Design an enzyme around this catalytic site. Structure first.
Site, mmCIF file in Angstrom:
data_model
loop_
_atom_site.group_PDB
_atom_site.id
_atom_site.type_symbol
_atom_site.label_atom_id
_atom_site.label_comp_id
_atom_site.label_asym_id
_atom_site.label_seq_id
_atom_site.Cartn_x
_atom_site.Cartn_y
_atom_site.Cartn_z
ATOM 1 C CE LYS A 200 -3.004 -2.590 2.938
ATOM 2 N NZ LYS A 200 -3.912 -3.260 1.988
ATOM 3 C CG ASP B 276 -4.161 -0.728 -3.836
ATOM 4 O OD1 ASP B 276 -4.538 0.411 -4.194
ATOM 5 O OD2 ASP B 276 -4.965 -1.641 -3.427
ATOM 6 C CD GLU C 249 -5.437 -2.980 -6.644
ATOM 7 O OE1 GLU C 249 -4.676 -3.892 -7.024
ATOM 8 O OE2 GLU C 249 -6.254 -3.152 -5.716
ATOM 9 C CD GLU D 160 -9.849 -1.770 -4.615
ATOM 10 O OE1 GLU D 160 -8.861 -2.185 -5.237
ATOM 11 O OE2 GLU D 160 -9.878 -1.576 -3.411
ATOM 12 C CG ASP E 187 -15.049 -7.275 -4.502
ATOM 13 O OD1 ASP E 187 -16.043 -7.961 -4.234
ATOM 14 O OD2 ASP E 187 -14.091 -7.145 -3.687
ATOM 15 C CG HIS F 4 -10.944 -5.672 -4.937
ATOM 16 N ND1 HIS F 4 -11.993 -5.755 -4.028
ATOM 17 C CD2 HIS F 4 -9.951 -4.989 -4.291
ATOM 18 C CE1 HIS F 4 -11.659 -5.131 -2.909
ATOM 19 N NE2 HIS F 4 -10.413 -4.688 -3.029
ATOM 20 C CD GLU G 74 -6.968 -7.682 -3.426
ATOM 21 O OE1 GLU G 74 -7.872 -7.602 -4.285
ATOM 22 O OE2 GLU G 74 -6.446 -6.690 -2.868
HETATM 23 CA CA LIG Z 1 -7.117 -2.103 -3.827
#
Ligand SMILES: [Ca+2]
Ligand SMILES: [Ca+2]
Ligand SMILES: [Ca+2]
Ligand SMILES: [Ca+2]
Ligand SMILES: [Ca+2]
Ligand SMILES: [Ca+2]
Ligand SMILES: [Ca+2]
Ligand SMILES: [Ca+2]
Ligand SMILES: [Ca+2]
Ligand SMILES: [Ca+2]
Ligand code: NI
Ligand code: NI
Ligand code: NI
Ligand code: NI
Ligand code: NI
Lengths: 378, 378, 378, 378, 378
Positions: A166, A194, A220, A246, A269, A296, A329
Site C-alpha cells: 500500500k 496500490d 492499482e 474495485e 469484485d 479484487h 488477492e
Molecule cells: Ca485495492
C-alpha cells in the site's frame, strides 16, 4: 421453488490499533453476509462489499422484490431488482447490496441443480489459483518501510508468489517502502503497488517513473475512480501497467472505464460489481479490447468462496497453452472471522488456493461464528 | 461552533390504493429528514431523495465524520464526507444521503450568519417562482385518459401555468392521454411529459414525433439514466426538448450527461445531486454549453424549501431583461405530511410560490408532525 | 445595504533600471486597487491584474451597474456586470477589472457577515501555506547566470522551499541559468521555470528535454496563451509538467485550456480570472480531469490577501491525509508599496505565510501609502 | 516616416429616450476615434468598437509602442502591439483598441503611397455595395410590433433591398414583430433578424422553426458568444442560416468559432476584430470551409469608410460571374455625429453606397464636429 | 495601369555528370522565369518552381486572363486566375505557374508604389538572414560519405552556420553519411537532413532514432507528400523535428498538412505555393498551432530575391526579444545562371545574406544572361 426469507448478518472485530490506507482509516473489521432461505429449505449465502450497515439496509429494501420469487431465475431477479432501486442507485451501495443477494441466489441455484457455481458459469478451466499476499496497513508509530520489508519477507517465506503493498501517502516515502520491499523479497517474487487513490496525477506519474526499475507488475487505483481521464494519463505517462475496478460498478461503470482506456487490468469484485450475474457481463466487455481481468477480493470466506468460483470459470484472453490465469488477492491482516464463518477454511497452502467443487459456493457456513462475531447493536 | 448530533426522521403515510409510474409502484408516501444539532443550540434540517430507510442508514454512516466538525465549513465537510464513502459510493444513495446532510448544514450556516441560503449562494434574482403541477399516477381500475384530462383541468382552474403528465407505459395509450390533456387544459397552458424511463429508444422517438403537435415543452426521462447514447438519440430523433437529471448524481454524473449532449434541460434535485454545495458546481457546468437548469422537486416541505432557496439564486443563462427563469415542480398528489412538517406551508397561490427570506431555509419544523407521521418500526 | 461609491487607486514606483522577462520590459511597478464604499460605511478593497490605467478605466465603466446595488449579492452582480461589457469583453481587461470589483465585494460581504472570505468560500483546510520565491528579471548589463545563482541561494537562505526562475530568452543560455541555479540551491530545494511565452514549440520541447535532469517541478507558459495545441504538444513532447493560467480568463477560457489538455497545473490569478466568484467555478472545472490548481500571484498586499483567502479554502484533489496543498507565489523583487498598502504586512517567515482570519480579506488598508505611491497624472 | 503623436477623440450625443436591445440599454450615442500624426505631417484616422472611454484608455496604453515607429510597417506594428498587451488581452478591448490604431495606420499608409486602402488590400472587385437597414431599438412605451412595421416600410420606401430587425426579448412577441415586418415590407425585400444573444438555445431553436416561413436570410447572435456549442445547436436545430462575429475577436477567436461550425455567415467588424491587418487573416480562415463573410458595421463615418474599403477588396467565395457580394449594414437610428465627422457623407442613395477611391480611407475628417460633439469630461 | 505582355524565359545548363537525390536524377539545371510588361513600361519578374517547360505552358494558358488587367490588384488577379484553371488544377503545376506570375505582379506593384515588396507585405523585421548550405547530390562513382564530409567542411569554412545533407537512399549508408558530416563540421555547426521522400515510414523512424544523437535540427520530407498520416507517424515515432512543404501547394494543401499535424516546420516555396499572395495566407495558418515557417528556396536569383523579401517580412511566432528568425536555404551546387540572371548577385557573405530594399524585388535582370543560357528549342 420460492424464496421465503432474506436476512443479513453483520460481523465486527475491533483491532488493537487503527489501520490506515491512503483512502481510509478504520479501527475494526466490519462485514455483512446475506442469507436467503427457500420454501424447500435451501439456503444460500452471499457477501456485500463496503459499508456494512448501509449494505444491510439496502438488502432489506430489496427484500420486498425477492420474497415469493423463484431463486433459480437469476437474470430475471437481477434485472427486476436493479431496476427497482435504479433511480437513486446505478453505482455504489445499490450494486454492492445486489451483489450479495446475487451470490446467495447462485449458491441456491447450484445447490438445487447439484452443481458448483463454476460449472453453471460455463466450466472449470482450473482447479486452483496462485494467491498473492496483500500488505499491512499504515499504523500509528510503526515505520512503514521496515514493517513492509519484514512483513513481505514473511509472506515470501509462506510461499506466496507475489505481494502488493500500500502506497498513495507521499512519493518519497512510498519509494523508500517499495525499494525496501524489493530488497526484502528477492529478485523473483512479483510485486504490485496500490495507491488507494491517494495521488494526484502528477504524483502518480512521478512515482511510476521512479518505481518502475524495482519491477512492478501493476499500479492499482493510482487516482480517484471518477477521473477516468486521469487514469488514462497515468497509464500513458509512466511504464507500470495500471489496474482498477474495485471502486467501479456494473456493466455501465466498467464500460465507461474501458471506453476511456483507463486500465491494463480490470478488477471487478464479486461482492461489489453486481455479483456473478453482472461480472460475467463485465468479463465479456473486457474481451472487446483484450483487457485482463484480475478480481479484487476483500472480505470473509464467503467473498473468498465466490471469487474462487468465478476464478475457476474465467476464460483466458487469449486462449493458448499455459495461458495467463487469474491470481487471488489474499488479505493476510488480522481478522478472526475471515475463516471462522466457514466450516472449512479456504486458505493458501504454499501460496496456492484450491477451488471448491461442491454444489453452489461449495462451502458450509458456521452459524456459531455469526453469533460470536455479531456486530453490537448501535 | 461544532456539530453535536445528527438524527434522521422517517415519515410514512399509506395510500388508499397504490400509485404507479412506468418506473415504480408504491403504496405509501415514505420520506426521510436529516436533523443536525450544534453545541450552541442551532439546528439545521435537510431531506434525502430516494429510498428512505437506506438513506437513513447512509446518513448514520456519515455521522462519524460530522460530530465535532464546524458546520459552517460546508465545502470542507462535503469533500471529506464525499471521499469517506466514495469507494462504494459515487452515485445513488451515497450522494442522496450527503445531499440531506448538506442542506441541513447550509440551514445552520444561514442561521449562524443571519442570512437566507439564497443570499449566501450569491443573491436573489427573484422572490417567487411560477409552479407547474405534476399529474396523478396510474391507479388500478382508473382510466388514465379521463383521469388525467380531469385532473389537469382542475390544475388549470387552480392557476397553474403548466402541468406535466406521466407516460412511458405504451405509445398508443400515452398519445391518447396527451391528446385528452391538451383538449382539457386549452391552448395556452404549457404541457410537459415524463416517461419515467419506461420507453425503448424506438418508442420514445415514435412518441415524440407523434406528440409534438400537441405542444409539449419537454420530454423527461425518455429512457434509462445509464444509456446516455440513447438520450442523445432521442434528442436528435424527435422534436420535443429532452429533460433529465433527477436520476443522475454529482458533478461527475452530470458532466457525463452534458458531455454526451443528453439533454436540453438538466434537472438536478437538491436532495439527490449532492445538495447546495454540489448543485452550484452542476449549475456552473451547465453554463459551458448553455443547457437550462430546471430543478427536479419531489418530497416534503423541507425539500420544497431547499429547492426554493436555490431557485431564488439561479443565475439566468443568458442574462437579459425578463430572462428564462426556473419553474417549480409541484406534486399535487396526496401527502398529508408534505406541508405538515412545516409550521407555515409553502404553497402555490394562483400558481406562484413565494420564496422565503428568513435565515437558512427560512422555515420552522413542526416536530409534532414528525411524531404523528413517524414511519412504524420494521 | 447598497453600494454608494466605486473608486480606483493607481500606484507607481520607478525602478533603478528596467526589468525584462521574455514577455515584457518595464521600468516601474504599476498597480491599481479598487475601493467600494457602502451606505452603512463598509468599505471593501480589491486589485486588478494587468495594465493599470486601462483597468481603472474599465472599473469606471462598470461603476454604473454597481452604484445602488446590494454588495452581498455577489453572484448576481458578477453575472450582471459580466454581461454588461461582454460584447467587446469576454477575456482580458473586461475580466481583470471585474476581478478587482469582485474581490472588493467579497471583502464587504465578509465584513457584513463577520466572516473571513475563506469561511464564506466554504471553509479553511489550512491556516498557512508554504511560499515559493520568484526570481529576478533580466537587467541591462547583468549576467543572468550568476545573478540567478546568487539570488536563489539568497532565497534558500531565507527559508523558501522552492523557487522559480525566468527563462524564454534562448535555449542555451536558459539551460546555463537553470544549471547554475540548481548548483547554487542544493539538491533538495524545489525548482520551477517560467518562459513567459517566449519560446517556439520546438524551443520549449528542446529546453524541457535538456532541463529535466536538473529536477524541475513545472514549466510555466512555455508558449503563447492562444495556441492551446502548442501547449498540448509541449506537454506531450518533454517530461516537465506544464503550467499555465495567468494569461487565461474566466470559466470559458479556462475550460478551453482544460479541454485541450493544455496543462498539468492550472494557475488562475484571483485578480485576473474573474475574482472569487469565478475562481470557484474554475476550481470546479479542474476537478473533472484532476488538474492541480496553484494560483498565480502578482501584485500588492491586496492581491496577496485575496490569494491567501482562496488558498485557505482550496479543496484537495484528491482528499487524503497530508494532501497536495497550494503553495504561494511570492515575488521578492523591489516594490516599496507591495506591503505598504497594508497596515500589517503579509510576509513569508521561514518560507511560510500565515493566512488572515479576520472578516473579509482580514486586512486594513493604509490610505497614507495610497497617497505616497500615487501614480502621477498623465 | 515616424509616428509622432497618437490621440483619441471621444464623441457623445444624448438621446431623447433610452434605446434597448436584448443585450444592452443605452441613453446616448458614444464613440471614440483614433488620430495618429506623423513627422511628415500625415494624419490617419480610425475608430474602435465598444466602450468608448475604456478603448481610449487602451489606445493610450499602446501609444508607447507606437511613437517613433514607421507607420508603413503595419504587420510589424500589429504584432508588436498585439504581443505587448496580450497577457491580459487576447479578446475584447485589447483588440478593439488595436483595431482603431490599425485603421489609422492603413489610412497613413494609403496617403503615403497615394493609394486607396482597397488597392493596398489587393484590389477593387466592386465600386459600390448594396446596404441593408437596421431596425429601431426597443423604447419605453413604444409598441415594438407597429414601430418596426412602420419603420421598415419607411426603409423600403428609401430603397433598401433588405432590413434587419432586433429580437431576443421573448419568442411570442418577437414572432409578432417578424410577421408584422414581413407584411409591411412586401414579399421581395430581404429580412434578417438579430437576437443580440438574448435567447436560450431552446428559445432560439423554437423562434427559428416558427419564423422560417416568413423568409429570413439569417439569424444573428442567437445565443451568447462564449457558448460555441450552443451556436452549433441552433444552426443544426432550425432552418435559418446563423450569423455571428461582431462579439468575437482576432484570428484565434474567429478560428475557434469556425472550427466549432458555429455560423453560416461570419461578421467581423473592422473596428473590433483587429483592423485591416487582422480581418484579412480572418477572411483567409473563412475560405477553408467556405463560410461567407458579411462585415458587422456599427459607428461613425470613420467605421463606415473602413468597412467600405474592406468591402471593395473582399474576394468572392466562390468566384463566379455575378458572385455573392458583401452588403453593408447601415444603422438608420439617430446619431447627428455619424456623418458629421466627415466632410462628405457616406450615405445610401436608393439603397446603394459608393466606395471611396481616394488615398487611404478616402475621407477628410471634420475637426469642428469633433469639438461640437466632444464627450463631456467625467 | 494595364498588363500588355506576359513572356517566359527558359534557362538551361548541362552538368558534367548527373546529380541524384532519392526523389530524382537530373543532368541539367533547368528553370523558367516569368516576365510581365505594362502599358507604362513597368516590367516585373518572377520564377516558377518545378518542371520548366510545363510551367511555361501553364503561364501561357493563364496569359489570356492577365492581358489588359491592372497588375496592382494582386488579390483580384490571383483569385481570378486560380479559379480559371482550378478544375484540373488545385495543386502542382497550376499553382507553381501562378506563383511565378504572382511574384512578377508584386514586383510591378512595388515599382509602381516605389516600395520594396517587404514593405508592402507589412514591414521589415530584419535586414539580413543567416543562410544554411545545402549539400551535393549523389553522383556516379562518387562516395557519398567522403564527398559530403569534405563538402560540408568547405561550407563551414565559408562561414555557413548550418548545412543540410541529402539522404533517403538507405538507412545504413545514410547514417554513415550523417556521422561523417558531423565529424567534419565540428560540434557547433547546425545540421539538417532531407530524405526527398525516399523512405518508408519504418525506414524514416529507424533513421531518426539512430541519427538523433548526431544533433539534427530537422528531418525534411521523410516520406511522400500525399501520405500525411505517414508524416504524423514519423513525427511521433522519432525525435528529430519533421519539416515539409516544398511539395505542398496553396492554403488548402498546406492546411491539410497542418490539420494532420504533419510537421514541426512548414516550408512553403515562394515560387511553388502560390506566390506572395498565397504565402501570406499560409503564414497565417501556421500561427493557429504555432508551427514555424522556414521557406524552401530552390532556383535562380529571382527566386532568391523573392524569398528574401518574404523573409524580411516574416512575423516571429512568438514575438520576443531576439526571436526565432527564418534562415535561407542556399544551394551551393553548380549553376552558372543562378546569379547571372541578376545584375548584382545575392550571395552569402560569411554565411549572411543581405535583403534588398529597392522597389519591388529590388533587383535588375540581366537580359544578356537570358540569351546566353536560353534553353535550346526542342
Ligand atoms: Ca485495492
Ligand atoms: Ca514518464
Ligand atoms: Ca420525473
Ligand atoms: Ca423523427
Ligand atoms: Ca508567470
Ligand atoms: Ca522529448
Ligand atoms: Ca448585431
Ligand atoms: Ca427544428
Ligand atoms: Ca528539400
Ligand atoms: Ca523511436
Ligand atoms: Ni483479534
Ligand atoms: Ni391520507
Ligand atoms: Ni525603490
Ligand atoms: Ni439629436
Ligand atoms: Ni558549368
Amino acid at each position: 421453488m420460492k424464496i421465503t426469507a432474506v436476512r443479513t448478518h453483520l460481523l465486527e472485530h475491533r483491532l488493537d490499533t487503527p489501520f490506515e490506507s491512503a483512502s481510509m482509516r478504520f479501527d475494526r473489521r466490519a462485514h455483512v453476509l446475506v442469507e436467503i432461505e427457500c420454501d424447500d429449505g435451501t439456503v444460500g449465502w452471499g457477501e456485500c462489499l463496503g459499508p456494512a450497515r448501509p449494505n444491510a439496509a439496502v438488502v432489506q429494501a430489496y427484500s420486498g422484490w425477492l420474497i415469493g420469487q423463484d431463486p433459480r431465475q437469476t437474470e430475471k431477479i437481477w434485472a427486476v431488482l436493479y431496476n427497482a432501486l435504479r433511480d437513486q442507485g446505478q453505482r455504489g451501495l445499490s450494486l454492492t447490496a445486489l451483489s450479495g443477494i446475487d451470490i446467495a441466489l447462485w449458491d441456491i441455484k447450484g445447490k438445487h441443480y447439484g452443481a458448483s457455481i463454476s460449472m453453471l458459469l460455463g466450466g472449470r478451466w482450473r482447479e486452483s489459483v496462485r494467491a498473492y499476499a496483500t500488505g499491512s496497513f499504515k499504523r500509528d508509530n510503526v515505520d512503514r518501510v521496515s514493517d513492509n520489508a519484514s512483513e513481505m519477507a514473511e509472506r515470501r517465506a509462506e510461499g506466496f508468489h507475489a505481494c502488493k503493498i500500500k502506497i498513495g501517502f507521499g512519493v518519497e516515502e512510498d519509494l523508500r517502502v517499495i525499494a525496501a520491499v524489493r530488497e526484502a523479497i528477492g529478485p523473483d517474487m512479483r510485486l504490485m503497488i496500490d495507491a488507494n487513490h491517494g495521488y494526484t496525477v502528477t504524483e502518480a506519474i512521478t512515482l511510476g517513473d521512479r518505481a518502475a526499475g524495482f519491477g512492478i507488475d501493476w499500479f492499482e487505483e493510482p487516482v480517484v475512480p471518477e477521473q477516468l481521464d486521469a487514469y488514462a494519463r497515468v497509464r500513458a505517462g509512466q511504464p507500470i501497467p495500471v489496474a482498477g475496478g474495485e471502486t467501479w460498478h456494473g456493466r455501465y461503470g466498467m464500460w465507461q472505464a474501458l471506453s476511456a482506456g483507463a486500465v491494463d487490468i480490470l478488477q471487478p469484485d464479486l461482492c461489489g460489481c453486481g455479483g456473478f450475474s453482472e461480472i460475467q457481463k463485465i468479463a465479456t466487455l473486457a474481451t472487446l479490447h483484450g483487457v485482463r481481468i484480475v478480481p479484487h477480493v476483500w472480505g470473509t470466506g464467503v467473498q473468498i468462496a465466490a471469487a474462487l468460483q468465478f476464478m475457476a470459470a474465467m476464460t483466458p484472453d487469449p486462449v493458448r497453452v499455459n495461458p495467463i490465469e487469474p491470481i487471488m488477492e489474499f488479505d493476510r491482516t488480522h481478522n478472526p472471522f475471515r475463516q471462522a464463518v466457514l466450516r472449512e477454511p479456504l486458505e493458501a497452502v504454499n501460496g496456492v488456493v484450491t477451488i471448491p467443487d461442491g454444489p453452489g459456493l461449495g462451502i458450509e457456513i458456521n452459524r456459531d461464528a455469526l453469533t460470536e462475531f455479531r456486530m453490537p447493536d448501535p
